[PDB]
Amino acid sequence: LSPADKTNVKAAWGKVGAHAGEYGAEALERMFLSFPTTKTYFPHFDLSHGSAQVKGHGKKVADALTNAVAHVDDMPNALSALSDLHAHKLRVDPVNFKLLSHCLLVTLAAHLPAEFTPAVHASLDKFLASVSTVLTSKY
Amino acid sequence: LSPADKTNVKAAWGKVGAHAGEYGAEALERMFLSFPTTKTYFPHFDLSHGSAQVKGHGKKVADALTNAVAHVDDMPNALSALSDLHAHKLRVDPVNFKLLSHCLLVTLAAHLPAEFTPAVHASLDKFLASVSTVLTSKY
Amino acid sequence: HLTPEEKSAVTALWGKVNVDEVGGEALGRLLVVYPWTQRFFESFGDLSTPDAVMGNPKVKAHGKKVLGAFSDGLAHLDNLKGTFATLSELHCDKLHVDPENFRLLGNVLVCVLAHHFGKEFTPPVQAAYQKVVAGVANALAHKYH
Amino acid sequence: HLTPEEKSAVTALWGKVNVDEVGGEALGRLLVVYPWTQRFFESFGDLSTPDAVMGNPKVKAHGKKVLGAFSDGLAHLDNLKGTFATLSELHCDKLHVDPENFRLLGNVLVCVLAHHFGKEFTPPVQAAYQKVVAGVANALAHKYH
Ligand code: HEM
Ligand code: HEM
Ligand code: HEM
Ligand code: HEM
């Protein structure tokens, strides 16, 4: 990412803070309702509204994204283990990362309408695209 | 790219050799016929079969791919100027890098029957996808 | 294909949409987030930076006409291929726009509805609109099939 | 959507297709080149290496059914929505296969025809076959739209 991109992402995710996991859970829920082809990857989950399993997984995703922002300059070594999990073991179709990235943007917009400028929208999209490239890099 | 993919790419591309320029001209011709939306990018070319200009541009595309093969480990710096031309100046829609990559695979299949195994097919797609990732990295 | 309680939440929320601003908002964000789309719009003038694009009189004007085509599609959700026949011909035969871009504009609109409507834009509301924007996207792309 | 000289080149080359082997070589190549697709064929057995996939007898057997479905498409080029309405339901509502993967199998089919026909698989012939595969992928995607 460019210098301006780094600044807009760190700033936006700074002002997410403790809400990180709550936001992650909402993005998974928006994903499961809008794109029903993604429910097949979680047969061992209660995918009903308010589900405790979705809340706990929400926080795991959020914490993975917080590490990514904190290691923006060395992203393939901050997410190395999750490419193995996502590509080799689970065989997650690459389109699905684009569906989660989009629901994660619809969440940041509904909750942070003051920070969700068109320039910050563009910075977060390149950031989630980069995260998506690293997690599909074992294909 | 994995060491096995590097060996497979070098094997295949070694056998192309002196005909690389001819094959690049065939790929461009196959793309204009199959995906006629790609022609909007060459309004200053004669795009008839055997056009001097398409042969000329075939050699430029091929010489760049040979460079990319000789620098597989430092692709981002070998192609950085081509990344600027195609994103900043030309504004080429990323979907178009997938149509030209497919037309290259079709050209190599038709010329190198013995060399175009499943294993070699897969390594060449990864390589052309790697080349497309760099050329669209200013987005 | 929307259920009665989907079609009623879709139509309910639209009546509260500032038809003037949201259209320009949606078109402006597409040009800044996916900069290759700018080459279709050269005559609109200065798209050099994010402020040049959002404050651009022709972008804001053209956005009213986009949102206005979205408004007519909701009314006729049972005949989109018909409503969008003339725009399909324009976008696919004259302009040569890759159908992947129809989906991206649909997805940028959803992000913008979420920006304005906030907590009123619920996950089940979003799933109903994601059905609308895909249906629009496929109606526009029919002249390629 | 095929000129008269297109439809005649398409038909002429298809008649020479080894119906026993091409469908298995195409399905086998989809699974090796795009490995996420292997999760839908879990019960076909050993898909652990490239050599396991190509010689896997369930892959060859199912490869003949896929090619059969394409022959049926070529015979009904003017009504593809109607010929594939049952297969679309299987792939879309039961199996939950993303429509992008339909384009990938069609493009892999085009690579395999070029492998087998070499010089005969001319650019004009390839462009007639691309329209067909696009035709078939859009018909299999109909139950989403
Ligand atoms: C930005 C994108 C993504 C991130 C950052 C991400 C991150 C993670 C993390 C951190 C885990 C848990 C690792 C652990 O156990 O410690 C995980 C598990 C998982 N992810 Fe993702 N993921 C992403 C996208 C996706 C998508 C798009 C899918 C499917 C549509 C998916 C499916 C799964 C599945 C099935 C698991 C395992 C659940 C279980 O069995 O416990 N992921 N992901
Ligand atoms: C693997 C993919 C590609 C490679 C390696 C490649 C390589 C090149 C090279 C080496 C040049 C010459 C630059 C110069 O004159 O210094 C060039 C120019 C160009 N390329 Fe590509 N290219 C690729 C894909 C594409 C695609 C997909 C499009 C459009 C669909 C495209 C459109 C152009 C155009 C319009 C020019 C400029 C032509 C001119 O003004 O003379 N390229 N490319
Ligand atoms: C997805 C929904 C879309 C809708 C509903 C839509 C709708 C429209 C409408 C109503 C017009 C004006 C037609 C007229 O009054 O003559 C138009 C023109 C146009 N659209 Fe779109 N469009 C969409 C997507 C796109 C995309 C994705 C692009 C480009 C990336 C695009 C590029 C254009 C261009 C270049 C014009 C002509 C502007 C001019 O020169 O006057 N459209 N569109
Ligand atoms: C143009 C593309 C395709 C065609 C023409 C096609 C055709 C067929 C046909 C004829 C069947 C057998 C129907 C039956 O026996 O009831 C079938 C089954 C199936 N297809 Fe496809 N298919 C296509 C693409 C795909 C893709 C991309 C996938 C997965 C990535 C897929 C996954 C399956 C599965 C899982 C089955 C069921 C296998 C079983 O019996 O256990 N198909 N397809």
Author numbering:
A (entry chain CCC), B (entry chain AAA): 2 to 140
C (entry chain DDD), D (entry chain BBB): 2 to 146
Sentences from the paper on this structure:
However, the microsecond spacing of MHz XFEL pulses raises new challenges, including possible sample damage induced by shock waves that are launched by preceding pulses in the sample-carrying jet. We explored this matter with an X-ray-pump/X-ray-probe experiment employing haemoglobin microcrystals transported via a liquid jet into the XFEL beam. Diffraction data were collected using a shock-wave-free single-pulse scheme as well as the dual-pulse pump-probe scheme.
In addition to collecting X-ray pump X-ray probe SFX data of haemoglobin microcrystals, we also collected diffraction data using a single pulse, in which case shockwave damage is necessarily precluded. We compare the quality of the diffraction data, as well as the crystal structures determined using the single-pulse and pump–probe data, respectively. Crystal structures extracted from the two data sets also differ.
